[PDB]
Amino acid sequence: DETGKFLVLALYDYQEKSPREVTMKKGDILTLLNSTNKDWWKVEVNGRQGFVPAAYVKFL
């Protein structure tokens, strides 16, 4: 969670299911905004902001 410091890789597709979530496709390179929760990380996906499951992304 240093905001904007790090990139993460989408390891799976994920379709947003609630309003604070965001959609990503496997292979997308996301900006990490907030990693303080163990289960949901806040990311930027082409500049949309939202939460995706932490288990579906990794650092490069």
Classify residue 27 as left (phi > 0), alpha (psi -120 to 50) or beta. Answer: left
CB-based burial label for 31 (10 Å; 0-12, 13-18, 19+) = middle
Q: CB–CB of 28/10 below 8 Å?
A: yes
| Total number of domains in the chain | 1
Q: CB–CB of 39/13 below 8 Å?
A: no
Resolution (A): 1.5
Instruction: Give the separation between CA 26 and CA 28, rounded to whole angstroms.
Output: 6
Instruction: Give the separation between CA 49 and CA 30, rounded to whole angstroms.
Output: 10
Instruction: Give the separation between CA 24 and CA 12, rounded to whole angstroms.
Output: 8
Q: Which domain holds residue 2?
A: 1-60
Q: Which long-range contacts (CB under 8 A, 24 or more apart) does 27-33 make?
A: 29/60, 30/57, 31/4, 31/6, 31/7, 32/1, 32/2, 32/3, 32/4, 32/5, 32/6, 32/7, 32/8, 33/1, 33/3, 33/4
